[PDB]
Structure 1
């Protein structure tokens, strides 16, 4: 089928950087385009579960979502082929350009991510690991969401267990760090942390807290402070994303209207 890419259809030009459990290269895909190619090391992911879901994932086509183009599975290590995002991760894009962006621009970056997340929410697809590190920057400074649902395939328990050393506790809602209870409402909590990373120009949330300290702090009502560039209205929306009860958090469809209201007026 079309989703399978033959090794003869790909060339590797240069490294982009280290991804999770594998290297990412810049390359070309025959008769198509420039692409980013991930080589995944053996044992890191459930390749069979991923191959079963690949065609399904490839139908989640939205301009604010980084596209999966196909899979090169002929030989180990398998390759995953994606839409190439010229300006890389949003985390480094902000950190290297501190002082450049106006709040209107930072809000527009949050609006791009929110639009991609409202599409996934309508499709009943949970991201599970939304953070600035997997939002990528493309043409005309567009931000696109990447790696939605990919943690379903990770095999290292240090990453998947809510108590594992590499679990993204900093972006987790309490029902996720307590019970791994994923939903679009737990993605909303993560989106609030993403808004904080954006308005802080790429600062690390809860920088001097261990993961166990973040659990206790969040459970006892602590919340991230307001970034200097965030207005009080922006910070109010961040706090709505961090409500303890998932039912009290806004849906992405509601956030998209609230943030656009601020952006368009």
Structure 2
């Protein structure tokens, strides 16, 4: 209505119901929009985000609609702090979900999680949109057990230099290819690398990649051509898929379309 662009939500239309957790930018809550529609509401801590740049990008993000991408519904801009309003995912982040051993996952469920993520990423690739921080911690799980990719592209707006510098204490070293660690070369193929690490996280039930190494040791290990190895739950065929994401030469890594084909082949075979 009057006073609001298409990317803007009236915060008065929100009802807050439950605190979900705290992340990069602060508190996240579950609520309803206009009494009826489930939403997640992220309260963006002052000083954490490049807000004007994010708001301009929100206009682009609004148009990224795929069933396996967590939808951005809009932003509450008039105010301190700003809110980001997104699709509600009742079962929380994928990393925590994998780590709950009560689920007693079958490997067919693990492969389906990989396919969910791969479908989202194939869509993003088709739009020439890089995630830039793909990892289990950036995926969410809905009440049907469907995994969706969240926070795509958001790292571009983080003001904490510990996160954004490749030498920073909070940089995603363990999800980064050599050309990122060596020279900050981001590309479709750095998202591919990260996807392989995410498949490893899924098949490892949420272990930390390179869990016995520091970030510095990990960078050395991978720059020297060594890799993660096969999780016990991954078949040879699954391991081949995640390993293909880690070619030293970026141009030899598959696309998300090829990875999706490969995952579907294994689903049919196994």
Q: Is residue 96 from structure 1 mapped to residue 100 from structure 2 by the alignment? A: yes
For 2:54, the equivalent position in structure 1 comes to 50
Q: Is residue 85 from structure 1 mapped to residue 95 from structure 2 by the alignment? A: no
Q: Is residue 29 from structure 1 mapped to residue 33 from structure 2 by the alignment? A: yes
* Distance in 1 (alpha carbons) for counterparts of 2:161 and 2:36: 37
Map residues 160-171 of structure 1 onto 2, 5 A cutoff: 160-171=164-175
Any unmatched runs of 5+ in structure 1?
A: none
TM-score (norm 1): 0.97
Comparing 97-106 and 173-182, the one that deviates more: 97-106
Comparing 41-50 and 2-11, the one that deviates more: 2-11
Q: CA deviation at 1:31?
A: 5.7
Q: Quick check: 1:98–1:201 contact (8 Å CA) kept in 2?
A: no
Write out per-residue CA displacement over residues 204-223 of structure 1, whole angstroms, 9 at most, x where no aligned residue. Answer: 11112111111100011221
- Of residues 183, 187, 202, the one that matches 2:191 is 187
Q: CA deviation at 1:14?
A: 1.5
Any unmatched runs of 5+ in structure 2?
A: none
Residues 99 and 54 (structure 1), Cα distance of their counterparts in 2 relative to 1, 3 Å cut: closer
Write out per-residue CA displacement over residues 102-132 of structure 1, whole angstroms, 9 at most, x where no aligned residue. Answer: 1111111100000000000010000010001
For 2:219, the equivalent position in structure 1 comes to 215
Q: How many residues align?
A: 265
Comparing 18-27 and 59-68, the one that deviates more: 18-27
For 1:10, the equivalent position in structure 2 comes to 14
Q: Is residue 253 from structure 1 mapped to residue 257 from structure 2 by the alignment? A: yes
- Of residues 116, 121, 127, the one that matches 1:117 is 121
Q: Quick check: 1:126–1:187 contact (8 Å CA) kept in 2?
A: yes
Q: Quick check: 2:15–2:35 contact (8 Å CA) kept in 1?
A: no
For 2:208, the equivalent position in structure 1 comes to 204
1:34 alignment partner, SS class? strand
* Distance in 2 (alpha carbons) for counterparts of 1:187 and 1:95: 23
Q: 4+ residue runs of structure 1 moved beyond 2 angstroms?
A: none
* Distance in 2 (alpha carbons) for counterparts of 1:174 and 1:82: 33
Q: CA deviation at 1:243?
A: 0.7
For 2:132, the equivalent position in structure 1 comes to 128
